[PDB]
Design a binder for these strands. Sequence first.
RNA 1: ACAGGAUAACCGCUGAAAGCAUCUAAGCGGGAAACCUCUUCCAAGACCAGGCUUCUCACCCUCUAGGAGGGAUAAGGCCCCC
RNA 2: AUGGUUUGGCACCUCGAUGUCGGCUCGUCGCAUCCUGGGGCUGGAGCAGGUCCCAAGGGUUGGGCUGUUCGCCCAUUAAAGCGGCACGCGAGCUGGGUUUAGAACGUCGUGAGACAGUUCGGUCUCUAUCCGCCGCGCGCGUCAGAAGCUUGAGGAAACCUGUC
RNA 3: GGGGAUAAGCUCCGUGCGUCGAGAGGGAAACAGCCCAGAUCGCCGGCUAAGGCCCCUAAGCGUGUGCUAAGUGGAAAAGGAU
Lengths: 176, 37, 23, 214, 146
Amino acid sequence: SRIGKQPVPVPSGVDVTINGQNLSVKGPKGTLTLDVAEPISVSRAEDGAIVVTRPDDERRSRSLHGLSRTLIANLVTGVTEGYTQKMEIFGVGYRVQLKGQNLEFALGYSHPVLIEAPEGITFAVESPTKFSVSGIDKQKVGQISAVIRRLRRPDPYKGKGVRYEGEQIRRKVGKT
Amino acid sequence: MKVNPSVKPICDKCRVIRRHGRVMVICSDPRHKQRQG
Amino acid sequence: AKRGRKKRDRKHSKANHGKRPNA
Amino acid sequence: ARKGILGTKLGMTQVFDENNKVVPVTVVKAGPNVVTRIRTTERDGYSAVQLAYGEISPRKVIKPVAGQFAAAGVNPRRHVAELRLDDEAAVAEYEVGQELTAEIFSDGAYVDVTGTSKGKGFAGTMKRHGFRGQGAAHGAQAVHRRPGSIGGCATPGRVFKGTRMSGRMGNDRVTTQNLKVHKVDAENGVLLIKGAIPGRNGGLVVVRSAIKRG
Amino acid sequence: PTYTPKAGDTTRSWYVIDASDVVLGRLASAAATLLRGKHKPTFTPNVDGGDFVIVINADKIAVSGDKLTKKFAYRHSGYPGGLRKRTIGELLEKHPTRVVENAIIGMLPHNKLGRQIQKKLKVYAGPDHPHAAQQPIPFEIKQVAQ
RNA sequence: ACAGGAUAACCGCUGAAAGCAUCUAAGCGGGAAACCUCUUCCAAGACCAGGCUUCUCACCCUCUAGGAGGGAUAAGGCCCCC
RNA sequence: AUGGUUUGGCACCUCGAUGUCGGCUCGUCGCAUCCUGGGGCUGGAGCAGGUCCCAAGGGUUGGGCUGUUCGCCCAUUAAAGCGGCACGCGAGCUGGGUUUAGAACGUCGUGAGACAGUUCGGUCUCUAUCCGCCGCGCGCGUCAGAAGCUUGAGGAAACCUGUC
RNA sequence: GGGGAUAAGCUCCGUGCGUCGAGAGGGAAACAGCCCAGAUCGCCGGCUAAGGCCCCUAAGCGUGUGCUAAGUGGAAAAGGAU
């Protein structure tokens, strides 16, 4: 509603191909895809924006309108800038490095762990205890970041594991 | 995950939602997390 | 249990009109 | 991708290792088989190869079989089995006619054989399936070796297929797996398998590289 | 008295249906109608006099609800604990023909005549068929107003 | 066995209705000795009665030529025999 | 509210016969799960755990006393599961118990004799017609008669775990 | 209405109430007591009740306006819930 009615800004070199409902957005970072369902119309606001439109004000339409808007907003935003999550490895003797594209952890196990880079994202380490995950497809970015986050079973006693940069985790004490 | 046919928003932050045909109580306090079933 | 209940609930059909013998 | 060969069981014996352990080795004489025919996804819909072993004096073979052999060009043989392979990979190394020889294996190679078991006739439960029979004293009225019960009473009122009973055991195809190989003799065309392979001395085996280990 | 078809009476035809996102129930009822012969005026239940049926694009059948993945086809070998089941999705991706067949077979009599009818049912997972030399009549499922 | 697919409880990413929020309502994922494949056995009487092949791949007389019948055969099998 | 296994309520089929406790042998099924496997919360530091969810594939000991089921104990175990199928199974076995006639003790009865009190002893019949089940054959069929090699619908078997 | 636990296909009484008994046929998936209806015999005649009209099963994937997203429909409580 309040989000699904807004038009969406569109800067300069941002080529939007309205092949009916199927939409596809080209910018210097790549040419992303998107699809939508039959009901909702994708009109191009000819001031330099895109606007969603719906026939009905039923449950499905009220739900799906705003979704489509927010998705295309993320889409054009990424192809202009991108997304880059930051993650930070608190611990004792824990560490991260990189091997070309693919990344390497030391997390107390008896073997080390690695990750295969998917097609559309790259890793970027700034220190052995601190890195980022830079991509475009926000789904993918947060996916892989959380997959990392879930390697170490959490431990709120001493503060080990992986943390999203602004993760303020909970804590307790085992005093004895 | 306390499984009970009675769930409630115990504290002030427990939000009551519905996933997949099951009522749930999500909260930052995992003691409070629960569901029907 | 089950058997008696299914008897007593088949009775609520339409061609019986709410009643059957031996329930 | 799966090396197999046909052979004849002979017996069993002992030999020794470098650490002076003893290995109960079974002998097999994989005489040089011949490839009679082939199986492909265009002709037949699967990938395979068809082998031949033995000797017939030329008048004991039948004319259909003599045609199956003379069409492929080669001479008749006793036993004709068929390995089932995966694809062009396992086909591109076979040719009609060519003589296989036992050297295709190497010491340490893990194999699986297949053979027709020995017969035991009309067997009871205590030999098929290893039942505790019943007591030999304390009052037994003639049940010293026969099974017992067979089901319920008016529920089901039947006997539950696969209920185990007496009948002909033996004389079935059987697969024995993960057998190491101790020595190969090229002079005499012989394998010295380890272990203990199915069948009666003078029959037919089929040894293959094992699935779990090949 | 009333007319009863003799031996040299039957006239056959080969019909062909598309299963392009048709509903399984509609399709199957139509085929049962045709095979059993409830569309000709020569109908008699003691005689099989329907028409051959050829179903195509059978892997395009699409159903409603969650029946693709909440619905369970069952079987039983006869042995104990030999009840084994399958969804509809697994069964399409294994072999699609069986879904449509069994669906139709439950819309027929399960008698001798029904078995002798199933012979007259040909089903193919793709768009094609080898039965072009009968020039199969396309059937379009229609509903008569009144 | 190893591995592989779809999954349960569960963990989630993106995100509305409901300006935030939410594992879901559209979608995308990971995930158990259970499930389907894989492993060994049987099996085309699987009546949708399969397939690739090979050999023989040719005689005679009747009923009035109606369609059957009745002979001697090839490939091959069976019986008798060790 | 369940489940229908427990002591009971009704007395609806069976008294021109439905053979009854336990044990053995042999299973097969349910999960409201003993172990193994995955998991959420902790008054969870770690090792051990407590409770809850999913989960049935496999496995789930030998022994002393008692006729005993149940139970208690010993020694181990990864673990020593709960129940159904005429309280599974006697045309498959036992027959210790209970429930024929013998006999004795206590108590009741004047007496014959009785006791959901006790104690020692005491015949377990049958050639499988049909269904069913494990195996094995003859015949016919699959549009000519035959011989070999085989694909795979669909079914079965197996699936356990420990210690350094 | 009593006894019973305000349980029983329980038991005991009432009733110009019923049916079965002694009563077929149709519907109820099969089903003595439920709903319809009370069989003189025949007809390769018609109209209707209860019930039902996607195929099996003869008759409507009938018309109109709205609800349902739960396979509810095609068992169920106290209570819980944007």
